């Protein structure tokens, strides 16, 4: 699209409509973009000394990108609630994007006095990496997505990436991608950039919780017909004499019943409690946390494989890195106290996946014989096994929406671990930069790189609309399901509202599983 200077390049679309089966969440926000790295690509690396587990090598670019991989960039409390309360599941189908009403300003810091003014002509160029030839950054839970609250103006993030490294230094194989080596489209004012995408058949996120659970799944009333090993030894006057007898598992017997499927896999996490007291006093934050390691650098295992966060009656506990944790609007960056964060809870799964903090089961160790007692041992890490079945990490309104499946020789069940939809070809990276403006050059020629540009930034609005599909409920469940509600009682502030000084804020994390489906 194209037009004039006194012509709005696009209108403001920010609705949300439900169609019974679909529902489209349109949404627009105003943004701003500075000139990063003063227009140059800069090489960047870990700090020489820095622990090995923390080295790196890569580049930062003068390019800034766009991102809305956060559910709340599309759903509004209320809306989300609608969804989350009457749908067995849902998934994204297609999207449409558009930047417009772009405007380029140029600040002038003459002595003690700045003065911003329109640089009409100068441009901002955009380009979408629709061929995925660029290090996909999104999906890395970074923060600089869209504001949950419309009215909020925002700054565009700067693109940076990482290649290979042998400590703080580069290794040859590492590649250096240059963003100008693409065909950016250049916008001036009166210019807009639209583009549209279509998702790929993915599974509806399961937005329901299970009423039955693996173990308790058969019918009480009837005993099976298969037998199991009831007792081993037997009374012989005073002493026992080994004599194995078997029984037919019934209701009273349950624990012993024969089955057909196994809980999901696991990778044991340390348990910490919301109650300061209980927790051993010391620094096992890193030392005790569950991790894995590549090329000799141990990394953390955050968002551990999807597994319930606490047994019955222990909402007080949680994994050291088995859950998602968001900050309460305002919460500072580092070492903030428990009271400043919102920890997610995944009890809803208990029913199928193991509890993060407790071992999977316990396999037998030795082979018993008359002169040898029967061994056994608990298992803290069980990789996928036939017959296992499980549930993936719920979603949360202010959580990630999707993530790119890495291009590898092999993947195994790609639901992104941080939760979300695992996409092979996700929404392409959208980039934006401000074509430089060489400030006054010298009369006599010089072949040096230009270094003195006009100080200036850009701004303008952006809009994103997405169509989601739904799987409606359908249970013959007689008694009421659970629903997500807002507290009745009076409060000094409404949830998901602007305070007295107009600061919007999300009180709690809102999950997705409320409706109840049987297993």
């Amino acid at each position: 699209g194209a037009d004039g200077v006194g012509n709005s390049s696009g209108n403001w679309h920010c609705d949300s409509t439900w169609m019974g089966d679909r529902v489209i969440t349109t949404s627009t926000r105003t943004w701003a973009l500075p000139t990063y790295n003063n227009h140059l690509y800069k090489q960047i690396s870990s700090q020489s000394g820095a622990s090995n587990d923390n080295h790196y090598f890569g580049y930062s670019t003068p390019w800034g990108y766009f991102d809305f991989n956060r559910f709340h960039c599309h759903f509004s409390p209320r809306d989300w609630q609608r969804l989350i309360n009457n749908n067995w599941g849902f998934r994204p189908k297609r999207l449409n994007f558009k930047l417009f009403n772009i405007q380029v300003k140029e600040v002038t810091q003459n002595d003690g006095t700045t003065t911003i003014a329109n640089n009409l002509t100068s441009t901002v160029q955009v380009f979408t990496d629709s061929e995925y030839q660029l290090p996909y950054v999104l999906g890395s839970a970074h923060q600089g997505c869209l504001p949950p609250f419309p009215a909020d103006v925002f700054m565009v993030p700067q693109y940076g990436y990482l290649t290979l490294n042998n400590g703080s230094q580069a290794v040859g194989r590492s590649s250096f991608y240059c963003l100008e080596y693409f065909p950016s489209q250049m916008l001036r004012t009166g210019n807009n950039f639209t583009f549209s995408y279509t998702f790929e058949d993915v599974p509806f996120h399961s937005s329901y919780a299970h009423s039955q659970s693996l173990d308790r799944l058969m019918n009480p009333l009837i005993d099976q017909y298969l037998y199991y090993l009831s007792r081993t030894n037997t009374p012989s006057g005073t002493t026992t004499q080994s004599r194995l007898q078997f029984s037919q598992a019934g209701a009273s017997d349950i624990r012993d019943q024969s089955r057909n499927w196994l809980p999901g896999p696991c990778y044991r996490q340390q348990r910490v409690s919301k109650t300061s007291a209980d927790n051993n006093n010391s620094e096992y934050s890193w030392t005790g946390a569950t991790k894995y390691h590549l090329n000799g650098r141990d990394s953390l295992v955050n968002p551990g494989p999807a597994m319930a966060s606490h047994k019955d009656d222990e909402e007080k506990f949680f994994p050291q890195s088995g859950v998602l944790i968001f900050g309460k609007q305002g919460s500072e960056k580092t070492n903030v106290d428990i009271e400043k964060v919102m920890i997610t809870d995944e009890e809803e799964i208990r029913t199928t996946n193991p509890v993060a903090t407790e071992q999977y089961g316990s396999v037998s160790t030795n082979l018993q014989r008359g002169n040898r007692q029967a061994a056994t041992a608990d298992v803290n890490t069980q990789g996928v096994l036939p017959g296992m079945v499980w549930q993936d990490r719920d979603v949360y309104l202010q959580g990630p929406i999707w993530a790119k499946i890495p291009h590898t020789d092999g993947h195994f069940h790609p639901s992104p671990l941080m939760g979300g939809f695992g996409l092979k070809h996700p929404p392409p990276q959208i980039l934006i930069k401000n074509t430089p403006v060489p400030a006054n050059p010298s009369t006599t020629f010089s072949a040096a790189k230009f270094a003195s540009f006009i100080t200036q930034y850009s701004t303008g609005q952006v809009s994103v609309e997405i169509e989601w599909e739904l799987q409606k409920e359908n249970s013959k469940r007689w008694n009421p399901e659970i629903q997500y509600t807002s507290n009745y009682n009076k409060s000094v502030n409404v949830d998901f509202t602007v305070d007295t000084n107009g600061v919007y804020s999300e009180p709690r994390p809102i999950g997705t599983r409320y409706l109840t489906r049987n297993l």
Partner: antibody
Amino acid sequence: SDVQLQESGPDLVKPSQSLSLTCTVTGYSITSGYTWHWIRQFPGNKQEWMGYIHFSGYTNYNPSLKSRVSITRDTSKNQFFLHLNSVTTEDTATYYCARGDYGYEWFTYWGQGTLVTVSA
Amino acid sequence: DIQMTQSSSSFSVSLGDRVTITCKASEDIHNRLAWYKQKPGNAPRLLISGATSLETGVPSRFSGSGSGKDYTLSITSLQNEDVATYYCQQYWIGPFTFGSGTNLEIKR
């Protein structure tokens, strides 16, 4: 004010001669990390950055000085050296060696400094 | 080369007072600026790097702020150890360049 590292070298040098200084480091290894720099201060006050040598042995020099400066290293000794040729009176100054916490930032540790005067 | 200019050439202050020093760059440094302290007859010492990050062992009284062209170093309550000249240094691009320095005479 405070730091560690020690420079050594002749106090006096004749003009057209070459200046050679050595910086001996203790409490740290020249390899494995950090870039070691040379900086000088003219008697008036200003600081001027001469150049550096990386842990890997790569060097970078100030463009003004580039033609007559050379920085080298002796890992065994844990010392790095500065060689400045075609010295002039302007070269008189206190020379410092310093470590650079590298990657993001700069000079974490500085030497005492050695005064070098260029006179006939 | 990027040129750094430091504000007050000299200040006199006593223990306990708050002092502020300014440094501005010819071009946008992008917070790659460090502050050093130098005592008489002594070599410089690193106070702050990355414009605002305190070096290990540096007291909380020291703080730095700034962005773009202009940066500032502030000492909340001067201490006797504080007497010295302070220099700002840019490491955005080679060659690295230093400011002219500000002499703080603490000591009545």
